[PDB]
Amino acid sequence: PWELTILHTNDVHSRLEQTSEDSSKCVDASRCMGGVARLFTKVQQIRRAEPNVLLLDAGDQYQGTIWFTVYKGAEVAHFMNALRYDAMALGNHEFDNGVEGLIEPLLKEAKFPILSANIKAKGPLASQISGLYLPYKVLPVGDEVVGIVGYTSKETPFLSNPGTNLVFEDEITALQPEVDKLKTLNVNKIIALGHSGFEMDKLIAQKVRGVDVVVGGHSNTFLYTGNPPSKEVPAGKYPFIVTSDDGRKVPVVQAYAFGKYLGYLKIEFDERGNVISSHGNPILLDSSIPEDPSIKADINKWRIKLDDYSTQELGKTIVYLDGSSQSCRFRECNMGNLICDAMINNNLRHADEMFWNHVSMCILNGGGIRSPIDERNDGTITWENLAAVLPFGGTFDLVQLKGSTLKKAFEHSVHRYGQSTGEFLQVGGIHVVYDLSRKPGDRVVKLDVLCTACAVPSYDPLKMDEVYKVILPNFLANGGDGFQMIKDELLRHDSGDQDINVVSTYISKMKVIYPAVEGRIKFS
Amino acid sequence: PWELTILHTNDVHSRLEQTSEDSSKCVDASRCMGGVARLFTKVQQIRRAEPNVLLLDAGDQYQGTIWFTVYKGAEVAHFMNALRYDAMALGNHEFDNGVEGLIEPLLKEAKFPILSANIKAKGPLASQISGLYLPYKVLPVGDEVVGIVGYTSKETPFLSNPGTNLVFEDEITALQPEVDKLKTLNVNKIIALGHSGFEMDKLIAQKVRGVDVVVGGHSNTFLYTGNPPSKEVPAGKYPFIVTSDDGRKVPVVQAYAFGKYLGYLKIEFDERGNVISSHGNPILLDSSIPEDPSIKADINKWRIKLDDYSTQELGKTIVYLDGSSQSCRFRECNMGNLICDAMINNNLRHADEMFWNHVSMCILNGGGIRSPIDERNDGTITWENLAAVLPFGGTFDLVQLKGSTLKKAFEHSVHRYGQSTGEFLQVGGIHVVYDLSRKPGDRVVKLDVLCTACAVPSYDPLKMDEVYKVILPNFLANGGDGFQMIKDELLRHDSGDQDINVVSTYISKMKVIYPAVEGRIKFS
Numbered sequence A, B: 001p002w003e004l005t006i007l008h009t010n011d012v013h014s015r016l017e018q019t020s021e022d023s024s025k026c027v028d029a030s031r032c033m034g035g036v037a038r039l040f041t042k043v044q045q046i047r048r049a050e051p052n053v054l055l056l057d058a059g060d061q062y063q064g065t066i067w068f069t070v071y072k073g074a075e076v077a078h079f080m081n082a083l084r085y086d087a088m089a090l091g092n093h094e095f096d097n098g099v100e101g102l103i104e105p106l107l108k109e110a111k112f113p114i115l116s117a118n119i120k121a122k123g124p125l126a127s128q129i130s131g132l133y134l135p136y137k138v139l140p141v142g143d144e145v146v147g148i149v150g151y152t153s154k155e156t157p158f159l160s161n162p163g164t165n166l167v168f169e170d171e172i173t174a175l176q177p178e179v180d181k182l183k184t185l186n187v188n189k190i191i192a193l194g195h196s197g198f199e200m201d202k203l204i205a206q207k208v209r210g211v212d213v214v215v216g217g218h219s220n221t222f223l224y225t226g227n228p229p230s231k232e233v234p235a236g237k238y239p240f241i242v243t244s245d246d247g248r249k250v251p252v253v254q255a256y257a258f259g260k261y262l263g264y265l266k267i268e269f270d271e272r273g274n275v276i277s278s279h280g281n282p283i284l285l286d287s288s289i290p291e292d293p294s295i296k297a298d299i300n301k302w303r304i305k306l307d308d309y310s311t312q313e314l315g316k317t318i319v320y321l322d323g324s325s326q327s328c329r330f331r332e333c334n335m336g337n338l339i340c341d342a343m344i345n346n347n348l349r350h351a352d353e354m355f356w357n358h359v360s361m362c363i364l365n366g367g368g369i370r371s372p373i374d375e376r377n378d379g380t381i382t383w384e385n386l387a388a389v390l391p392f393g394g395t396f397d398l399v400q401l402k403g404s405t406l407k408k409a410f411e412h413s414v415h416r417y418g419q420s421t422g423e424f425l426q427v428g429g430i431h432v433v434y435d436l437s438r439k440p441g442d443r444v445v446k447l448d449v450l451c452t453a454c455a456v457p458s459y460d461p462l463k464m465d466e467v468y469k470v471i472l473p474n475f476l477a478n479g480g481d482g483f484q485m486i487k488d489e490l491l492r493h494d495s496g497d498q499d500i501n502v503v504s505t506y507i508s509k510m511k512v513i514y515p516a517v518e519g520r521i522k523f524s
C-alpha cells in the first residue's frame, strides 16, 4: 500500500505568533501554544520521518490580529511560503479586504496553488483573476500523484466583501465535474480541501463521488480520538469516518482553529487509489515543541513594523474618553460604550460564520477598562493609547445565552454595588435600569435588548426562555469576575478577534469618534 | 500704470457641475449657476478683453459631491488644468484623503504651482513631498512679474487628516520671510493667496509687510459693492480695503464658495509696484452666461463613470431600513436615524471650519425620506437605492440656533400630528418626548440634547437662552415645511455637502449598518 500523511491547518485567523491556550495574547511565555514557528518545527520533523507528506490549509488565514491589520495578507503569503504549504483553499476571510486585497498580497505571492472550484468570476474581473486561483491541482507526491479540489462557503457574500463580480455556487454541484476531470486524467487519489464547515464537509464525503478524503474548516470543529489534550471538547473522533453513497469510507478532518493544533492524518491507499485505512489525531502545538529559530527570527524581524504601528495615529476623538474606574465600575461610561460599539461593528463587518453575523448585543466588565484617553492634544488616538485602556491581552468572543442567564449576569453586575469591584457591566444593544434599593438578585427592573431580525428593529423586553447572541471578552465567557452562570449555562462559545486590534480598526474606520453617555444604563 | 486683473475662486467644494442657486443639485435646468464650464466662458471672455490676467484659487476644491467621491482629486487637476489656473493655495479639504490623496491626484498632475508657505514637512515625507507644493512662485505676467505666496489654515489638523509628518505654522510668521525673499529677488508686486479665513486675511494685509493684495477663502465670505445680485448678504465691500502697518491700502478679496461667483479685481500699480487703485466685484455665474461647450463636453464624458457608480455596491444593511411615510412622518424610524447619523459623522470627519467641527445634533423632516430599502437580497445598498430615499437634490447644512428656536421647531414638528404631513422630525444627538394630549405649542415635555464639550459628555435639558449647532437639510434651514422660525431666528447658516453623497460615503465607510429605533423620540 502507498501511505500518505496529510498535515493540515484551518481558521488560523492571523495567529502568526504563539498564543495563550485560548488564542489570546501569550501572557505566560512558558505555557504558550501555536504560532507558525512552532508549527514549522513539528511539520519539519514529520517530513523527515515520513516519505509522502502534504501540508494543506483549508482557509481563513486572513483576519484576527495586528499582523493582518498592518501587513494585510503579505504576512500570510510570506509565512505559508516559508512553511512550504502544498495548497490552500480560499475561506470567507480571504475576501475581507475585497478581491483586490486577495489578488495582490496573497494570490500573486503564494508559491503554492490556491483552490476553489465553486467561485465563478465574471465581467472585467474574469480575465483579471483568471488562473490566480484554480478549481483543482494535480500534485506529484513521492512517486505518485494526488489531486486536490477546493471549495469555499456559499455564505461568503453575507460574511465578507467578495464584490458583485464573483458568484459562489453550490459546492457539491460545482465539485462533481472537477472531480470527474481528475478521474478522466487518471488521478485516483483525490482530496477535497475547502472552507464550508463540518456539516457541508460530511455532505461532500457522502455525495461527491471520487473524493477520498475531506479536509475542512470554517466551523472551527475539533475532532479527537481518546482523551483530549486541552480545553476543546471534541465534536467526534478523528478522523470522522463518513461512508459515501458509493459505499467507501471517507475520512473527514478539521483541526479546530488559531493554529493551536496541527491536523495529522495517515492514509493507506491500494494500487487503485482506494483508502484501505486511515488513522491519526491532531497534535497540540504546546510549549513541549520548540519554536523553529529560523522562522522565529523572521517573525522578530517582521514584528518591528508592528511595534512601530503602536505610535501611529489611528483617528481622533472630539470627546474626553472616560475610562476611569470611578466612572466605569459605577455607571454608564462613554469609553465602555465605545468599546462595545467597536466589538459589535467589527464582528458585523468580519463575522466568522452566519450564526454570528447579526450579533448586536455586547457586555463588557467595567474592571476591564483601564485608563481614560484625554483629547488634548489634537485628539489623536494611537494603538499605544488603546493598549493602556485594554491591557489584558484578551479577545472579544461570541456566546449564545438564554435570557434567564443574561438576567442573572445583570443581577451579578450590581449585586454588591458600591464595593468598587470590576464586575459592573458596560453594554451595547441593551438598555438596563437598576433599582439599587431592592434586594441583591432583584435589582434589575427593566432589561430591554435590540432585536435586529424583525418588523421594526427595536429594543424589546428580554424573555427568560428566549436565546440571545452576545459579544463579550473571553475573560467573561470563561466565567471571570464571578460570572460563573455565563460559563456554566451558555449554549455555544466561539473565540473571536484580539481586543486592542478590534478597537484600533474600528477607530481607523470611523476616523472621528464622539461616544457619549446616552441612557444605556439607568438607576431608578 | 500697469493694470493687473485677478480672477479668483475659493471653496469650490467639488461643485464641478452647475448647481441651483443654493449650491445643491440643479433641478430647474434654466436657473442653474456656477460649474466649471460656465466659469471657463467668463474667464475666457476677460482674458480676451484684458492684457494681464491671473486666475487663482484659494483652496478647498476637494470634497462635497459625487465628483470627489469617485475621482478623488483627479477631476480637480483635470478641470483646473483645462481652465488654465495660474496658481492655487492648499486648503484644509485638500488633506481629507491624507497626504497620499493629495500628492497623487493633484500635486503630481496639476500644470500650475500649488502654494503654502506655512506647511513644513518632516521625517520620510520631507523628500517625498519636497517641491511638490511651494512657499512662493514668481510668475511672469505680460511684460512684468508678480510673486504669489501661499498659506493654509493652522486649523487643518483638527479639520482634516494631514498626518503627523506635517507641521502647520503660524501664517504671519511663516509668510514674512518668504515675502522678504521675493523682495530680495526684486519682485515688487506680491499677492498673498491662501486659505485661513477672512479674519486672518485681514491680519495678513495689516502685518505682512510687502503684500500688495490678499486673495482668501475658507470662511465662504461674500464681499460685494452695491446691490447684491443673489441671496448672499455681503460681509463688506469688494474689495475690502485694509490699511497696512506700513500705511498702504491692501485690497482683501474672497468670492463666497461653490463656484457660484468669479471674483474679479482690477489693480493698477505704479512703476515701483505700489497699488494706486483697485476696483471690481464678484461676477454671479448665472444662466445668462453660457456653459463653454468644450469644457461641458468633457464634463459629460467624465460623468459616465459617475452614472456607472450608481449601481455599485456601497455596503450592506442587516436590518430592514424603514423609510416608509407611515413610519417616518409618525414616529422614530430607523431610516431617519441612519440619515442623521450619516449627516453628523460626515461633517465631523470633513468639517469646513472649526466653528462646526463638534456638531453632534441633527434634525431631518420625515417627509424628506422617500422610500424604504429592503435587505433581501444580500443586503447590498447602492447609490441608486439611496437616490430613491433622498430624491430632492438637497444639501446637509450647518445652523446655529437659540434653544428657544429649537424648542419651537419641535413644537411645530407635532403641532398638527395625525395629518400625515412631512414636518415631523427625525433626530440625532437629541432625545425628545411629546405628550400629544396637550395643546398645540405645548406638546414637548422633555427635550434633552447631547453635549460633546464637557466633563462627562451626555444628554442635558435644552436651555432656552443657550445657543446650539445643528446639521439639517437646506430645505429646513430655508424654512421649508413651515419651519419659518428656523429661517427667521437662526444666528448663522452655512451650506454643506450634497445629500446622497453624504449618506453613500457614510455607508461605504461603515460597511455594514444596523440602525434601529432606540428611544430618540417617545410619546407619553
Ligand SMILES: Nc1ncnc2c1ncn2[C@@H]1O[C@H](CO)[C@@H](O)[C@H]1O
Pocket (backbone or CB within 6 Å): A365, A366, A367, A368, A392, A394, A421, A422, A423, A473, A475, A480, A481
Ligand atoms: N483577562 C482579563 N480581561 C478583562 N478584564 C480583566 C482580566 N483580568 C482582570 N480583569 C479585570 O480587572 C479587575 C481587577 O483589577 C477584575 O475585576 C476584572 O474586571
Ligand SMILES: Nc1ncnc2c1ncn2[C@@H]1O[C@H](CO)[C@@H](O)[C@H]1O
Pocket (backbone or CB within 6 Å): B365, B366, B367, B368, B392, B394, B421, B422, B423, B473, B475, B480, B481
Ligand atoms: N427640497 C426638499 N428637501 C427635503 N424634503 C422635501 C423637499 N421638498 C419637499 N420635501 C418634503 O416632501 C413633503 C411633500 O411630499 C414635504 O412636506 C417635505 O417634507
Ligand SMILES: [Ca+2]
Pocket (backbone or CB within 6 Å): A188, A189, A190, A210, A211, A212, A272, A273, A274, A275
Ligand atoms: Ca481514490
Ligand SMILES: [Ca+2]
Pocket (backbone or CB within 6 Å): B188, B189, B190, B210, B211, B212, B272, B273, B274, B275
Ligand atoms: Ca508692491
Ligand SMILES: [Cl-]
Pocket (backbone or CB within 6 Å): A196, A197, A198, A199, A200, A219
Ligand atoms: Cl458546519
Ligand SMILES: [Cl-]
Pocket (backbone or CB within 6 Å): B196, B197, B198, B199, B200, B219
Ligand atoms: Cl474668518
Ligand SMILES: [Zn+2]
Pocket (backbone or CB within 6 Å): A060, A091, A092, A093, A195, A217, A218, A219, A352, A353
Ligand atoms: Zn470561515
Ligand SMILES: [Zn+2]
Pocket (backbone or CB within 6 Å): B060, B091, B092, B093, B195, B217, B218, B219, B352, B353
Ligand atoms: Zn477651508
